[PDB]
Amino acid sequence: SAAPKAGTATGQIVAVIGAVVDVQFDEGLPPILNALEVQGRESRLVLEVAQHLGESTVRTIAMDGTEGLVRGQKVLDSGAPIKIPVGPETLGRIMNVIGEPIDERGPIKTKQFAPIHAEAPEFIEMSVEQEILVTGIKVVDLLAPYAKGGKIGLFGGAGVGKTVLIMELINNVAKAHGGYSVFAGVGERTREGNDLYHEMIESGVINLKDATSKVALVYGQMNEPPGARARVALTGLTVAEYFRDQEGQDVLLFIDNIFRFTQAGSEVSALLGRIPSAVGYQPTLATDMGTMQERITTTKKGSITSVQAIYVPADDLTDPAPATTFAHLDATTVLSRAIAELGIYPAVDPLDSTSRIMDPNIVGSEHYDVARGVQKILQDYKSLQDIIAILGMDELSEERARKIQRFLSQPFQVAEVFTGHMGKLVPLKETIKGFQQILAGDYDHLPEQAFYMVGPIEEAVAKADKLAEEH
Amino acid sequence: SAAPKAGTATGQIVAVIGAVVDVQFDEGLPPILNALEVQGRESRLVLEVAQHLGESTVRTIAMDGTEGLVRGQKVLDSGAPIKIPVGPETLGRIMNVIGEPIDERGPIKTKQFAPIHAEAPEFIEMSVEQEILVTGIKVVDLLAPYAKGGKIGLFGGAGVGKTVLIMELINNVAKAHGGYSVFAGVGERTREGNDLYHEMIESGVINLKDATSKVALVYGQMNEPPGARARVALTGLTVAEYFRDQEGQDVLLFIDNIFRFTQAGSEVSALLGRIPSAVGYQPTLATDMGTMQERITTTKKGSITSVQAIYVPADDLTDPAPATTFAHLDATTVLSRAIAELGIYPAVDPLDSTSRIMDPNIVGSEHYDVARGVQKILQDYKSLQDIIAILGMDELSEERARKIQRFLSQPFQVAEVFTGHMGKLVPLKETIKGFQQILAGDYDHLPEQAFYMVGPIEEAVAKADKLAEEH
Amino acid sequence: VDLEETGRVLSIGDGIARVHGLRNVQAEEMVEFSSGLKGMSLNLEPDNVGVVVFGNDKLIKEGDIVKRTGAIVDVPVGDELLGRVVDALGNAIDGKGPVGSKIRRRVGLKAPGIIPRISVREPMQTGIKAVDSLVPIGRGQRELIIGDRQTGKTSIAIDTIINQKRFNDGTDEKKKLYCIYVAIGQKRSTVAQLVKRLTDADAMKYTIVVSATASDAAPLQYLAPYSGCSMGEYFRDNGKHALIIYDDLSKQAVAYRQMSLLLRRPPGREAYPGDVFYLHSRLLERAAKMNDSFGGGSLTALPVIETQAGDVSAYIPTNVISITDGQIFLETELFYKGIRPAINVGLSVSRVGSAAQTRAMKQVAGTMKLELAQYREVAAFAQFGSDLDAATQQLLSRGVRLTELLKQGQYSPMAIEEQVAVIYAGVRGYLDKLEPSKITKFESAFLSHVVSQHQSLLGNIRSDGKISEQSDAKLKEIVT
Numbered sequence A, B: 001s002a003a004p005k006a007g008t009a010t011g012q013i014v015a016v017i018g019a020v021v022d023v024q025f026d027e028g029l030p031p032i033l034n035a036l037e038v039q040g041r042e043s044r045l046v047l048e049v050a051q052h053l054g055e056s057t058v059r060t061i062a063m064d065g066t067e068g069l070v071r072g073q074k075v076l077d078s079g080a081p082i083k084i085p086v087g088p089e090t091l092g093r094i095m096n097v098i099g100e101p102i103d104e105r106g107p108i109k110t111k112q113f114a115p116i117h118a119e120a121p122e123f124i125e126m127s128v129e130q131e132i133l134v135t136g137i138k139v140v141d142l143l144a145p146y147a148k149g150g151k152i153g154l155f156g157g158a159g160v161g162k163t164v165l166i167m168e169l170i171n172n173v174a175k176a177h178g179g180y181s182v183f184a185g186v187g188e189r190t191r192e193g194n195d196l197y198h199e200m201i202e203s204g205v206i207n208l209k210d211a212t213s214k215v216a217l218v219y220g221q222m223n224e225p226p227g228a229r230a231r232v233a234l235t236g237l238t239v240a241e242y243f244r245d246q247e248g249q250d251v252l253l254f255i256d257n258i259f260r261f262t263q264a265g266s267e268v269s270a271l272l273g274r275i276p277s278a279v280g281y282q283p284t285l286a287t288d289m290g291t292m293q294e295r296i297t298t299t300k301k302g303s304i305t306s307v308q309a310i311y312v313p314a315d316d317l318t319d320p321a322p323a324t325t326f327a328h329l330d331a332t333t334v335l336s337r338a339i340a341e342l343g344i345y346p347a348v349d350p351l352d353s354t355s356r357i358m359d360p361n362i363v364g365s366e367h368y369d370v371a372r373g374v375q376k377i378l379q380d381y382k383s384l385q386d387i388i389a390i391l392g393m394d395e396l397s398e399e400r401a402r403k404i405q406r407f408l409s410q411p412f413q414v415a416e417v418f419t420g421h422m423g424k425l426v427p428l429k430e431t432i433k434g435f436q437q438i439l440a441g442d443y444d445h446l447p448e449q450a451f452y453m454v455g456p457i458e459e460a461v462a463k464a465d466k467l468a469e470e471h
Numbered sequence C: 001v002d003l004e005e006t007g008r009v010l011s012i013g014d015g016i017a018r019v020h021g022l023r024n025v026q027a028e029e030m031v032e033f034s035s036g037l038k039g040m041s042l043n044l045e046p047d048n049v050g051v052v053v054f055g056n057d058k059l060i061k062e063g064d065i066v067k068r069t070g071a072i073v074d075v076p077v078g079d080e081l082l083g084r085v086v087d088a089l090g091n092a093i094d095g096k097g098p099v100g101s102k103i104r105r106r107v108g109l110k111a112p113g114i115i116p117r118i119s120v121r122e123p124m125q126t127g128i129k130a131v132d133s134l135v136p137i138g139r140g141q142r143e144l145i146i147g148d149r150q151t152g153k154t155s156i157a158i159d160t161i162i163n164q165k166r167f168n169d170g171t172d173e174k175k176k177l178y179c180i181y182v183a184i185g186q187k188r189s190t191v192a193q194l195v196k197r198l199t200d201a202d203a204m205k206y207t208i209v210v211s212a213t214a215s216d217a218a219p220l221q222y223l224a225p226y227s228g229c230s231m232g233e234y235f236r237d238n239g240k241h242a243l244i245i246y247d248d249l250s251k252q253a254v255a256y257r258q259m260s261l262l263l264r265r266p267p268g269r270e271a272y273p274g275d276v277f278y279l280h281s282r283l284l285e286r287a288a289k290m291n292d293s294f295g296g297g298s299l300t301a302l303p304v305i306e307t308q309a310g311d312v313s314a315y316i317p318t319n320v321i322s323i324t325d326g327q328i329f330l331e332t333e334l335f336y337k338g339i340r341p342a343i344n345v346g347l348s349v350s351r352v353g354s355a356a357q358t359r360a361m362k363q364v365a366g367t368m369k370l371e372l373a374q375y376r377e378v379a380a381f382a383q384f385g386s387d388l389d390a391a392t393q394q395l396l397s398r399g400v401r402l403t404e405l406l407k408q409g410q411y412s413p414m415a416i417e418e419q420v421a422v423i424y425a426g427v428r429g430y431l432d433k434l435e436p437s438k439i440t441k442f443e444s445a446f447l448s449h450v451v452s453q454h455q456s457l458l459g460n461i462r463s464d465g466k467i468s469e470q471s472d473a474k475l476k477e478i479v480t
C-alpha cells in the first residue's frame, strides 16, 4: 500500500560517503529494504535502507549517483521496497533498476507494480517434473543437458564465450519460444544492451508498432553504482516472476552475469560496517547468491526456464564466486581460457560441465554412455597428451579424442562476425552414426585437423575433397 | 593453600561470548592463571583467569561449556590455578582437564594435588646424560634414534600414521617398561580414548581389581571447548611431573597431538583482545609451545622419556605449527601423504627425520654411515626418479634404494586390522648383514617389489619361493 | 516494561540484533522479537546482547521488543517426526500437516565419552558393493564422504539409506535403521527431488529429512546439523539405531563465518572464526557407539564435503578429516571414466579397521582395497612395461577385470549376500583372464540367474554368515 505512520516519514541525510548514505528520521523509522526518495533532487534518487544503526538513524545504499547530495537533504519514506511495474504492459520496453523507462518511449502504463523483494517459493511449491528441452548444440545440449525451469550457468574467465553463447541461446530458443521472455543485463557493457535492443527490433522480437513483443528488457549496468547492479538482477527477475505466477506461463530469463549481484556487495559490504572475508568479499555472499537464485524457479503455478552467466575473477574457479554459484545451475559449462588458444569454441571443457539431468532415462543410455566414454578417453587423454608420451604424440601404445574435440567445437551462428562460419547446429538429428563411430574406431582416420572447424562426420569426406592427400 | 583476602573473592560475570567470560570482582582481584568456580551451576564450571582488564575486571577462558551462563552469575575465586590430584592414587584411573574423575569409578582419593602451572626445571637441573633406548623399528629406531628423556615427535599430515605409531610404541615400549606411564589425549577422537582404555584392560596395563596399574590416563578432547584442549596436555604433564620428581622414577608420557595446545590459542587468541599473526594464529605460539614443552624433561631427580605427536595443518610443514615445534623433538619422523600412496608404512620420510642422538658414539659408526649412505643414495635417488631419466627408470647409468625403501616399511603390529601382517620388529638383532648388503651391492638383485611388504633380507629368498620366476 | 526479562532492540542489520535490556537472558537461550521471530542470544555483553536472528531482517527493527524463552536452543524430536520433512528448526514444511511432538531435545549436548562407548561392531549396510566390501561402514561411527561437485556424494548416501528397506519391516528389530537426512545450503528443489524420489522407494516412510535451503538465513544453515544430530540421538539413546547424513558441512562452513563476522568475533583463517574445529568436532563427536551397559544404541554419521578440484587437505577438510574415522573420497577426475563411485585408495580409509567388515568381507574383501593401495603404482606403470618381471602381470590382471566389478552403480542396492556373490568370484580369480568389457553383464545376470535358481547359496550367509566350504564349490560351478 505504501503509507507511513501519523509521524514524519521524513529523515534528513546525516552522512554521505560514496554509495552509502546514512539517514536520520525522528518520527517514523523506515524498515530495512524500504525504497527512500531523496528530495531536493533534479531527478529520481532512491536509497534502499539497509540497517537500523540506532540513534534513530538508518543506513542506505544509493540506487544511482550520490553527487551533490547535501548533509541535511530531506529523504522521503515510500513505505515499501523498490517496486517496479509488473505486467504485460512492460513487454517490448526497457526498464532500469527502479522501473523508470529508459527506452525513452514514455510512461509505462500498468495496473500494478510488484516489490523487487519477494518471499521465494516454498518447499510445497516446488516441482520434480523435469521435462527436457533441446538446444541443438554440441557439448551444451548433448554432454551437459538442459531442461525446463532448469538453470543454465556459463562460467567464463572474462572473455571466453559466456555472453556470445547467450545471444545464441536466444537465437535457437528465445525466438521460437512460445510464452514470454526476459533479459536482465546486470553489470556488463551498454554497447551490447544497445545492439541487443536493435537486433531484437530487426528480428521483430521487439516490435515498436503493434503489440507483438515477447521479451522484456531490464537493465542496470557498468556506468552505474553498485546499489544499482545489486538489484537490476532482482528487478529483471521480479519481472519474470509476475509472468510465471499471476499469469501462468513458462517464462525464460536471461541474466548477463548474475554474480554481479555480488560484485555489488563486494562494493558495498565493508563500507556498510562489515568485516571482510574470502578475498575481501562479504560475510553474506552465500545467503546473497542464495536468497536471489531461489526465486528463478518453477512451481505449481508456472515455470521459469532460465539462463544465467557467471564470471571467473582472475581466471580462478577457486574464487568463491564462480564456486558458490555452481550449486544452483542445472548444467555446467566452464569455458576455459587455455581453450580459446586452441580455438575450441565454445570453450566448454570436457570435465567441469556437469548436469542434474544427464541420466539414461532422459538423455539416453546410448548417449550418456559415449558421453562417459568421451570424457573417459578424454581423461587419460588429458594425462597422455603430456604424461608418458611428453607432448609429442606418436610414441607407442596406439590404445578419436582429438576428433571428438573438433566435434563439440560447433562454431555456430553468433560467431559469424569472425570468419563467415555460420549456424552450425541441428537438434540431435544426425549425431547418431557420427560421434559413436569416432569412439569405437569406425570411420576414424581422417588426417587430424582435416576435421577441425566443423562438426558432422558427413563433412570428413565433404572436406577430404577440399583438402586432399594422395598419389 | 588457596585462601583469598578479607574482601570478597567473588565476582559477577559481566560478559559472555562463547569461550570467553569476563568477570568483575570488587574486593579481591584474582591473579592471571587462577581457577575460578562458577556458582549457580549444575556441574563444575571453572574459568581460568587470563587478563586483568582494569575497571576491576578479569578475563577468563572457559574450561567447559558456557551454556546458559548468565550476566550476573557469581564466580568464586579458588585462589590458585587449576590443580589436579597428583599421586600413585591416579594410576589406572582416567582424569579430565580439571582432575574430575571420568572413568566413573568414583572419587580419586589423594594426599595432595599439584597446580597444572609450574615453573619449568632450571638450567642447573638439566642433565646431559643421553643413555640410549631401543624400539626395534626400522627408520624410527635405526635412522633417527631415540633416547631416555628424549622427546619423540611424529609429524603427520592428518591421517598418515601419527597415532597408529604411538599405540605401537606402547606395544614394544610401554608394557615392558619398568616405572610408571602416562597418556594425555589432547584434541583427537574419543573413540580411540575408549578403545585405548579397554585395550589397556584386556592387556592388564590397567587392571580394575588389584592395584597393578602403571599408566595414568588424562583426557580432554574434541567434543570440548578450547580452554579444555588448551590444558589437558598440561594436566597429563603435571601428572608425569609428580611421578618423576617427588617420586624419583623414569616416566613415559604419551601426548596424542601436543600442538592442540595451540589450536587452543588459535581458538581463544583473537577473542581475547589480541592481534593475529602467522595464518591468523597468535602472537604467543612460540612461548606457548615453549613454556609447555620445557617441562617434559629429565633432571637431577628423575627422567621423563616422552612421546608426542604434532599435526600438519593443510599438509603444510610450512605451517608455523609443525615447524616451530621441531626445535623441541629429540628425533623427527615427518610421515608423508605422498608416501601413503606408495603404501610405505610408517610414512617416515628419508629426509626430514632428524635426531640429536645419531652420532657413531651412541648409534654406531657402521650404522650411522650406511644411514648417511642410505639417505645419500636416496637424495640423488629423489632426483633421478624423475630428473634425467624422466620417471621411467632403466635409461643408462647403472650407477638398492627401492630395496631399502621396502626395508624400512616395517608393517608391524598396530597395522594388523588391515591385512593380517603382524609385529614386524626385532631390536636391531639381524639388521647386520642385511641392510649393508643392499648398499654395497651384495645380495642385491631380487625382482623389485618381490621384496616389498616385509623387512629382513632373509625373506628375499623366503619369498622368492612364494613368487618364483624361471624355466 | 522491565529490561530485566525483556528488551528493546538498539540496532539491527545483517541479522545481528544488538538488543538492549535482556538482563536475565542466558547465554544461548533463544529469544522472541515483536514481529514474532526467533533468534538466540550469542554475545552477552555489558550494554547489549547481540542476538542472531533466524530468518530475514525486514520486520526486525530499531525498538522491536524482545522476549525471553529461558531455554537453550533446543529442537523437537521423537518417533512422530519419522517420515517427514522439516526446515531445520523443527517445523514441518512438506505440507503434510503438523507433527505436534512432545519430547524436545536441545542441540548443545556434549558428546558421551570413553565409558558410554564401546566398539564399532554390527556394521551397517550401504548396499553399495564398492562401498561396503572395499570400505565397510560400521555402526556408531563417522564416515566422511568428501568429493568434488558432481561426483556422487548424495546418491551414495541416498543408496546407503535406501538399503534399510527390507530391514524396516522384517524380523530382527536390532537389524534395522532409521534415517536422518540433513540438507544444508541446497536448492529446495534438489531437496524435493529427494523427498519425492525417496518416497518412490517408500524409503521416506522410515526417514526424517531436514532442510536449510539457501533462502534460510545463515544461522539456520548453521543450526541445522546440530538439529539432526539430536534427531538421531533419540535412537542412540533408546537402543534403536540411526543414519544421519550431513549433506555439505562444507557449505555450513561457508555459512558459519557469516554469522560470527557480523558479531565482530575476529576472523582467523579464510574468515573461519577460529573455532571452525569446535564447529565440526563438537558435532561428529556426537555420533557414537553405545555399550550394552548404556543402551546398545548407535548413530552413524557421514559428513558430506565439497572437494575443491581434488584437494582433500584444505582448511575445513583437514578440520574434518582430522576428526572423522574413515573417509570415502569421491573424485570427479574419474567418474565419467566409468570409474564410479570413483574412490581413491591411499587418500581414503575405513580407519575403524576390519571390525566393520563381517567375516564375509573379511574373507573376500580382505585383499581388495590394499591390493589397490600399491597397485596405484603398477596400474600407474604397466602402461609402459615390456621387459620386466614377465609374470608381474597378475597383480595387474587383478585390478582391471575386478575394477569393472568394483563399479557399483544404480538406484538399487545389492544386499550383503549378493555382494558376497559377485565380487567374491573375483577375489577368488575365476572370471579373471577373460577380457573385461562384458563383466557388467555378469554382475547383472549372475543375480537374475541367482534369484531364479540359486536361492539357497545366499541363505548360507543368513545361517553361517560367512562363505561355506560348500557354496564355495557351488558358486565356483556357476562361475566356471
Ligand SMILES: Nc1ncnc2c1ncn2[C@@H]1O[C@H](COP(=O)(O)OP(=O)(O)OP(=O)(O)O)[C@@H](O)[C@H]1O
Pocket (backbone or CB within 6 Å): A327, A355, A356, A357, A358, A359, C147, C148, C149, C150, C151, C152, C153, C154, C155, C340, C408, C409, C410, C411
Ligand atoms: N551409480 C550411478 N552411476 C552413474 N551416475 C549416477 C549414479 N547415481 C547417481 N548418478 C548421477 O550422479 C550424480 C550424483 O551426484 P549428485 O550430483 O547428486 O551429488 P554430488 O555431486 O555429490 O553433490 P551435488 O548435488 O551438489 O552435485 C547425479 O547427477 C545423478 O543423476
Ligand SMILES: Nc1ncnc2c1ncn2[C@@H]1O[C@H](COP(=O)(O)OP(=O)(O)O)[C@@H](O)[C@H]1O
Pocket (backbone or CB within 6 Å): A156, A158, A159, A160, A161, A162, A163, A164, A165, A340, A345, A346, A411, A412, A414, A415, A418
Ligand atoms: N562461438 C565462438 N566462436 C569463436 N570465437 C568465439 C566464440 N564466442 C566467443 N569467442 C571469442 O572470445 C571473445 C570473448 O567471448 P564473449 O562471448 O564475448 O565472452 P564474454 O562476453 O562473456 O566475456 C570474443 O571476442 C571471440 O574472439
Ligand SMILES: Nc1ncnc2c1ncn2[C@@H]1O[C@H](COP(=O)(O)OP(=O)(O)O)[C@@H](O)[C@H]1O
Pocket (backbone or CB within 6 Å): B156, B158, B159, B160, B161, B162, B163, B164, B165, B340, B345, B346, B411, B412, B414, B415, B418, C349, C350, C351
Ligand atoms: N603402520 C601402518 N601400516 C599401514 N597403514 C597404516 C599404518 N599406520 C597408519 N596407516 C594408514 O593411514 C591411516 C591414518 O593413520 P593414523 O595412524 O590413524 O594417523 P593419525 O591418527 O595420526 O591421523 C590409517 O587409517 C591407515 O590406512
Ligand code: VO4
Pocket (backbone or CB within 6 Å): B156, B157, B158, B159, B160, B162, B188, B257, B311, B312, C321, C322, C323
Ligand atoms: O589424523 V591426525 O588430524 O589427528 O593428524
Ligand SMILES: [Mg+2]
Pocket (backbone or CB within 6 Å): A162, A163, A188
Ligand atoms: Mg560478457
Ligand SMILES: [Mg+2]
Pocket (backbone or CB within 6 Å): B162, B163, B188
Ligand atoms: Mg590422530
Ligand SMILES: [Mg+2]
Pocket (backbone or CB within 6 Å): C153, C154, C247
Ligand atoms: Mg548434493
